[PDB]
Design a binder for this molecule. Structure first.
Ligand SMILES: CC(=O)N[C@H]1[C@H]([C@H](O)[C@H](O)CO)O[C@@](O)(C(=O)O)C[C@@H]1O
Ligand SMILES: CC(=O)N[C@H]1[C@H]([C@H](O)[C@H](O)CO)O[C@@](O)(C(=O)O)C[C@@H]1O
Ligand SMILES: [Mg+2]
Lengths: 520, 104, 104
């Protein structure tokens, strides 16, 4: 778009419109973009430092930044989240509309103690979207820098970096270097705007419900089965302990031995740790007792891992060591902050279909019983996909990620992104933004040496994102009332999800989606 | 093609995560070894503990043998140490088996 | 409305105006902490309001003259409803509306 300097290039579109089976959200925020890296790319490495082989990395930092609207509180206000989670069985993304407008480039001059900031009306910010996914996709790794939950909050734009292959601190012949100046990008003075629109692929609805039934309780409790199972191997009503083979048919007085059609979901057990520090071991096991994976002689913790229940009935005090998502409160520090500065999610409502993360999967025969060799079973702590298995994927949270790019691989098994959300062959693309460098005054004699002297400058503008979501309506024939999410009627000093007296918005708990119920 | 990136190096190295993970279970800066629960958020100085979206491929480990005969065991293990499958009371070596990297 | 006037199901709506925040220069390293540093700025403009009122005409068959509102013919140092010598407008008395009369 073309406009004079004194002429808005867009309006503040933020709203929340529901119609039928669709909810269209639009959120507008204002962003600050600084010069990053001094308009330079810089090779970045784990060289020096001596970080453990696990942490060794090689890659690049970029002069560009990016936009990230991959969190639900980017487009769903908490009261809108409630409308979703309280009345819908599912939902998914469908289309997306993005706009960059009202961009103002400013020049900064520092003389002595005093700094002056003036408008540079001829400078340009450049935006481009990686629609062919040619750049390393850095979204979908739960990074900060996303659009803020509170529309009145101004955010800084995160800087783009990526990585490639690394052996230790060194690189390899295949490792890749990307110059974002190589792509075509739209240049904008304060009069220009920028827009694009995107359609999501077909993906399934997310499960904004819990099961009112469990896998081991699907049968009719009033009706014996016609199937029989081997019941005893030692005779009932015998004076000694004499060998026998006694068969019984399925009965309600024994749901635990009735033949069944299905298996619980896959499991990959994690250590159980109590929220009350006393019960725990007096050691520092978050690594040595970690459930981890082993890629290229390099260990990386599994978190959040295969979707499993967080604790059993009545054991609310526990949690898997790396098998739940944990959001920090606004106060929490960056490292080694106390329990009550963070919020731990509880995926307990899937215990209906999925193993508890802290427990075994089951028991397995491991020998051939005979009159001589006593039978033997062992426990299963890793259980891969078996035919018959049914499972519920890990739930999403107002604060949590929305989607992820499915890695481009020959093969993938059930590629829901492990942290929750939609796994997309072709996600929404990255939007890269950079301030055009503005050289200061060159010398009066020619010098072919790289230009290192630039007007210090930063830019600010608004950003608009419209997303149409589909809803899956609830058709439940349940008589009794369902569980619903609700603010606490009682009194307190602070409304939930609000600014305080200093003006700080705070999200008090994580809100997931599984409240309505349906049969299994 | 080959991948210019690995599963554990897909994140942005300049940007902390908003996710937190349980970091210590024994207090830092305590005179004794006192129990604690200390949480840290994802950081580039620790790619190995950052929450991630994906798992590596399936594995079915096989014995490692060196091309230089000295380093190897003084036995004939190509069967006794073989990773095999068991069909109808009959053993058959797995070769080439699930697709895995050949050396680190 | 008890203080006088028209009680409206749907009155004239509120007009909310705000200056867009203008961030000053961010740091050169990223920081996801809320932005607290802005160019101090204020705005000025004109505002226009046109209102059409209906009048109910007086049809009175009263013979004698009605009471009417009137500035005081006599002399004084200050015209009513005016600026003074420093330039301050002042409204000297409250003026209501009930002057004409009609039968009950
Ligand atoms: C319903 C149930 O769990 N039945 C189990 C019983 C019970 O433990 C006893 O009947 C206790 O009264 O024990 C068995 O060894 C048996 O005796 O056949 C196995 C069977 O699975
Ligand atoms: C980045 C990394 O691997 N961090 C790990 C640290 C490091 O070994 C120490 O910080 C060494 O400086 O050890 C832990 O037990 C801890 O202390 O929290 C577990 C954590 O996973
Ligand atoms: Mg509306």
């Amino acid at each position: 778009g073309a406009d004079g300097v004194g002429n808005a290039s867009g309006n503040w579109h933020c709203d929340s419109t529901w119609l039928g089976d669709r909810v269209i959200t639009t959120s507008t925020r204002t962003w600050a973009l600084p010069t990053y890296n001094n308009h330079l790319y810089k090779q970045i490495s784990s060289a020096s430092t001596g970080a453990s082989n696990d942490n060794h990395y090689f890659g690049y930092s970029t002069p560009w930044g990016y936009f990230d609207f991959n969190r639900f509180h980017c487009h769903f206000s908490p009261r809108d989240w409630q409308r979703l989670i309280n009345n819908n069985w599912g939902f998914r993304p469908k289309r997306l509309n993005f706009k960059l407008f009202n961009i103002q480039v400013k020049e900064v001059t520092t003389n002595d103690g005093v700094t002056t900031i003036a408008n540079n009306l001829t400078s340009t910010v450049q935006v481009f979207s990686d629609s062919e996914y040619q750049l390393p996709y850095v979204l979908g790794s739960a990074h900060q820098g996303c659009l803020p939950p509170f529309p009145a909050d101004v955010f800084m734009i995160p800087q783009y970096g990526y990585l490639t292959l690394n052996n230790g601190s060194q690189a390899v012949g295949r490792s890749s270097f990307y110059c974002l100046e190589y792509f075509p990008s739209q240049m904008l003075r304060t009069g220009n705007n920028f827009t694009f629109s995107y359609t999501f692929e077909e993906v399934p609805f997310h499960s904004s419900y819990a099961h009112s039934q469990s896998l081991d309780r699907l049968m009719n409790p009033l009706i014996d089965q016609y199937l029989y199972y081997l019941n005893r191997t030692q005779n009932q009503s015998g004076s000694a302990q004499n060998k026998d083979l006694l068969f019984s048919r399925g009965s309600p007085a024994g749901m635990s031995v009735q033949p069944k059609n299905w298996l619980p979901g896959p499991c990959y057990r994690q250590q159980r740790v109590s929220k009350t520090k006393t019960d725990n071991n007096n050691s520092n096991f978050t690594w040595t007792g970690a459930s981890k994976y082993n890629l290229n002689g390099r260990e990386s913790i599994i978190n959040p891992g295969t979707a499993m229940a967080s604790h059993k009935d009545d054991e609310d005090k526990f949690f898997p060591m790396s098998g739940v998502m944990i959001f920090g409160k606004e106060s929490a520090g960056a490292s080694n902050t106390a329990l009550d500065n963070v919020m731990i999610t509880d995926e307990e409502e899937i215990k209906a279909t999925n193993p508890v993360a802290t427990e075994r999967f089951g028991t397995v025969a491991v020998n051939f019983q005979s009159s001589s060799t006593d039978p033997a079973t062992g426990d299963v702590h890793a259980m891969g996909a078996l035919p018959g298995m049914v499972w519920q994927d890990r739930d999403v949270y107002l604060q949590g990620p929305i989607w992820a790019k499915i890695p481009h691989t020959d093969g993938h098994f059930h590629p829901s992104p492990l942290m929750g959300g939609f796994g997309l062959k072709n996600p929404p693309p990255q939007i890269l933004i950079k301030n055009t460098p503005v050289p200061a005054n060159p010398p009066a004699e020619f010098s072919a040496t790289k230009f290192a002297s630039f007007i210090t400058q930063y830019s600010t503008g608004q950003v608009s994102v419209e997303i149409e979501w589909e809803l899956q309506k609830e058709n439940s024939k349940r008589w009794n009332p369902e569980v619903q999410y609700t603010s606490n009627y009682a009194k307190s000093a602070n409304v939930d999800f609000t600014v305080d007296n200093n003006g700080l918005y705070t999200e008090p708990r994580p809100i997931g989606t599984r409240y309505l119920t349906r049969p299994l």
